[PDB]
Every structure is written in C-alpha cells, then in structure tokens.
Amino acid sequence: MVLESTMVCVDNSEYMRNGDFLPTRLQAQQDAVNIVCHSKTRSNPENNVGLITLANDCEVLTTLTPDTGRILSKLHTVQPKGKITFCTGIRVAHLALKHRQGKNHKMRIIAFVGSPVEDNEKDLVKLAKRLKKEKVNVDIINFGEEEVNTEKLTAFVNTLNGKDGTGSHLVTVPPGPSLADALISSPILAG
Amino acid sequence: RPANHRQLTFEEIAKSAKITVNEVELLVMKALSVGLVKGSIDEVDKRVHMTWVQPRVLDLQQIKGMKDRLEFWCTDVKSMEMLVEHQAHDILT
Amino acid sequence: LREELQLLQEQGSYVGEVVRAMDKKKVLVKVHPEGKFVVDVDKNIDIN
C-alpha cells in the first residue's frame, strides 16, 4: 500500500458551530473525521492520524496513532469557539509530522477551513515555498462560509506544489444546501 | 545615613516628629509593632537604637554606586584571595 | 589487607582435627560444629 502519515485538522473556529450542515457542523465534521479515518484505515494499516485545533491556541490532544478511537472521543465536547488562525495551523501539524519514528512515511496533512481568514497573501506564499522545500503535500477541503469561490486558498493550493506534484486538491463547499456526506463523497473516490 | 551608627537620640526623633518626649515611646515602639524595625530604645540618654530597616524604593544613580560597592568587593576578594594561594601555590604541585 | 579481606568472606575459615590420613593423599578431618569431611593435600605440609 501507499506509505504516508495523514494529519487531520478539525476547524474549531467560532464560525463552525452553526447547524447549516445537517444536523450541525460539529457532527458534520465528526462524520468528516469518521470518513477520513476509516478510509485511511481501509487504505493502509500503517497510517497514523492525529488531530489539531487550528483556531485560538494550537494543541494536539491525541498523539499520532493509527487508532482513531481517542480522536473520536475528542470530537465530542471539543468546545469550538475562537478565531480562525491559518498560518500556524499547517506548521503545527508539520511539527507533529517531524516526530514520526519511521521516516519512510510521506508527510500528508488534511485540513478544513470553514471561516474567513485574515492571513495575508504574503504569509501563504511564504508557507507555499516553505512546503516546496519541505515536500509536504497538503489536501485541504473547504467547509463553511467564506469568500465566494475562495481565491487565496485556491492560489495557496496551486502555488503550494507543482510538477506535478500529484498532488494537492482543494474541495470547496458548493453554494447550495447539501449533506456533509455529499461534500466528502467526491474526495473519498478521487483526491 | 551611611551609618551604622544605627543608634539615634531623642532629640532627632522629637525634633523631626515635633512630638513630646513622652510620646516618642509610643511612636518608635508602634513602628516596632508594624514590623519596619526591630530596634531597641535606650532610655537613659533617651537614645533610640535602630536595627535592620524596612526597604522602600531607592533611586537612579544607585545602580552605579551599587557597582562601585560591588566592584570594590570584587577587587578586595580577588586581591586578598589571590594573595592567599599565591603563598601556597608552590607547595601544592 | 583488602585482598585477605577480599579472600576471607567468599569462604570463611575454620580449624580442623585430623583423625586419619589416606593413601590417596586425602585426610580425615571433622568440621567440628557439624559432620565430618575428608579432604586432600595441601601440598606444603605433607602427610608424614
């Protein structure tokens, strides 16, 4: 199977507590963690997946482990109130990826951005060239309400990698009512 | 005062505090109860012997003179102690 | 001192009484607090 370590990032920003995604984004992104942890389980047994809180202070409560049980426990009562912070959210998972015992696993990060961010374009392009030097491939899936047809995030994924690098894909929520399972139905079949 | 020379007199307290000589007892001994000084009072000449002190503030150009009081302690110990083992450095080997 | 202080624990030491000697060079001696043993030369002092 493919060798890599996937680090899932839940969105704890205060804008993620609304029930627009049925029944609530808390359970919606919980099912999103359910489908990414079960797919990586069906993908390779050697994949270890932790969680990271992006907004406010960034702390990983569950050390990187192949078992998602403790991750599912932290999905409940997470108290996702705070202001979204982007620039640190990728690097905090990058440090968790440098603590891996085995060096044969590729560095992989999946994050959810459900809130408008104040991150400047200079900061995301500095992280883009930094990830170019660090080879890390990040697959982001945009939830929630944000700038219509997100650009700085799309340009972030574009300028993140190149040639090929097969790759970083960005999935933005369509402007219409839908279930969270329908939003994650596309990435699970094809990245 | 640079002092100590921590023994004062009744004339110093009674003139500064402009209080009668009978109330300087209550005066200085209440400060003993406050805790700012532990000193004792010599009532023969009516002198007041202070002990220790209560540190409150201080000031600029005091960190400099503090380096003077320090560096003097530095060259004191350095000189004398380097003289001590200067004598016995031979016999050690 | 330390060497004899190292020698003497792992074994101890005692005093025997010879009740007989052997043609094989051994000697009949008692461990007095306990039952007897029979041991051999002991090449400095001979049997005779």
């Binding site: 990983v60 440098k98 | 100590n4 409150r56 201080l58 380096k67 320090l70 102690e81 083992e85 | -």
Partner: protein, 286 residues
C-alpha cells in the same frame, strides 16, 4: 510545595547521553525528556529518567509536542520493574528556557499534581553546580494582573545513595581526596569567593543592561525593593562592630594558644624519641 530537589548524576547523564543520541544527528534546539522523580517528603529526590524524541518549530516558536505512547507504556515499563519510580515532571537542556516551555508542564499536569521542570547543561562551563530547577506555580502578581505562571527557582543539589556512589567515586581517578583541612577549605575560598565576584558582577551587569536596553522595564517589579535590600546593610562601624573586632581577637586567643600547646607536645615527643633512637642506633652500630 517543592523546596529543594536532589539531582543524582544518573539523571543528568541520562539527559547528556541523549544529547549524544540526537547530537550526532544534530542539530539545533534542545534535548527534552520526561523526568522520573521520587517524593519521600517535601524535599524532592530524583533517581531515574527517560528521554523522548522532541522537535520545536521556530515559526511558530510556540509549537511543541511529545509522544504520549512513549510516556505511557514506558512508564508502564519502569513502574513495573520499579514500583517506587514515578514521573515528577520533565526536563530540557536549555541553556535558557524560551517562553514556550510553560505549556509543556500544563499538558502533563494531568499526570502529576505538580510537575517540576529541570533545566540541565550538557557542557559544563559556568558558574557552578550545573542544571537548574523550576517548579510550576501560579504566583499571580502584586499588580493584580490576570494569573500568569512565572516558574519559581528551586535550589538543586547533587547527591547519591549507595551504588550510585560506588560508580562515580571510582570513576574520579583525578584529584586528591579530600584532602581534609589543608587544600580543601582554601580552594573553596578561591572558588566560592571568585565565582561569587563574577556572579554578582555579571548579574549587576545585567542589572544596568536591562535598564539601558530591554525596557520595559525591568524596573521595578522588584528592582526598587531588591536594590534597597542591597542597601540594607552597608555595613560598617562605629560602634558595636568595633567591639566585635577585638572580641574576635579574643576568640583567636584560645585556638592559637592551643596551637602553641600542640607545638610543644609534638616537638617534645617526636624530637626526644627520634634523637634517642638516633643516638642509640649510631653509638651501638658505630
């Protein structure tokens, strides 16, 4: 709370040999591990420890993580083999703690009620007894600010018990032992004196440098009171300090009087007996 800690040479080496572990691969940052303490009483003792791989980004200088599975099952390993050993905190090689080291203790406060972090030093240079000890405590402030944690310094001492004494006491093979009464006290007069000179010198150099550069502020949460404590005692005579002078002279009387007494006794015995056995050996042989 925690007053003083006893740091054995075993835990210090357990950090430094791990500084060889990740030091051969380098590069930056510091060696961080989990500290195994032993609490018999208010005085804290340390016996064993274990180190965990740790990395800290600078970007993001506030990002830190440890491996909890390593802390969990190895604690299950060391508690198994030794039931007296438990984790009292963590440690790092410093040399000076960055502001991010607080949250590490705040994470492991679930393991131990009070986690004491021990800064250590892998390369001995200055000024004295190595490492350091900081206990996690909330002192708030006299300024009534929202409660913040500034770790209080815990005095650290080096000690051992039995076998840990055996190993190092044979491993010295360096300087005379002690020797009691001659070189011992006077070399300590050099070290404690001179290292006390450059201590306060460089520390008073920081006193003026912090006022010159670095404000705010550092003046004066404690500057005004601490510096006045320096101005507590100048402290010279007159008067009673003059009485202590010749009283101290009266104190040296007895001891030096006894010195002359030992001189007479040592000279009497040795000289008489030696000349006896000398003149006798010469007159009998010659």
């Amino acid at each position: 709370a925690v007053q003083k800690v006893v740091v054995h040479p075993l835990v210090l080496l357990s950090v430094v040999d791990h500084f060889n572990r990740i030091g051969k691969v380098g590069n930056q940052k510091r060696v961080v591990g989990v500290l195994l303490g032993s609490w018999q009483k208010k005085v804290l003792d340390v016996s064993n420890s274990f180190a965990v791989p740790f990395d800290e980004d600078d970007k993001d200088d506030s990002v830190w993580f440890l491996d909890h599975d390593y802390l969990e099952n190895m604690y299950g390993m060391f508690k198994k083999v030794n039931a007296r050993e438990r984790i009292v905190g963590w440690y790092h090689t410093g040399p000076k703690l960055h502001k991010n080291d607080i949250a590490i203790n705040e994470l492991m406060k679930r393991y131990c009620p009070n986690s004491v972090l021990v800064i250590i030093d892998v390369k001995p240079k200055d000024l004295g007894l190595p490492t350091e000890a900081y206990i996690s405590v909330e002192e708030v402030h006299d300024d009534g600010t929202p409660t913040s944690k500034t770790f209080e310094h815990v005095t650290s001492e080096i000690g051992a018990e039995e076998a840990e004494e055996v190993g190092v006491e044979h491993l010295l093979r360096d300087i005379k032992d002690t020797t009691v009464g001659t070189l011992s006290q006077r070399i300590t007069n050099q070290v404690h004196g001179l290292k006390g000179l450059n201590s306060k010198l460089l520390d008073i150099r920081s006193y003026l440098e912090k006022v010159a550069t670095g404000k705010l502020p550092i003046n004066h949460q404690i500057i005004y009171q601490l510096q006045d404590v320096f101005n507590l005692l100048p402290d010279v005579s007159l008067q009673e300090f003059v009485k202590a002078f010749y009283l101290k002279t009266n104190d040296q009387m007895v001891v030096v009087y006894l010195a002359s007494l030992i001189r007479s006794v040592v000279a009497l015995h040795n000289l008489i007996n030696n000349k006896i056995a000398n003149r006798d050996a010469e007159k009998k042989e010659g």
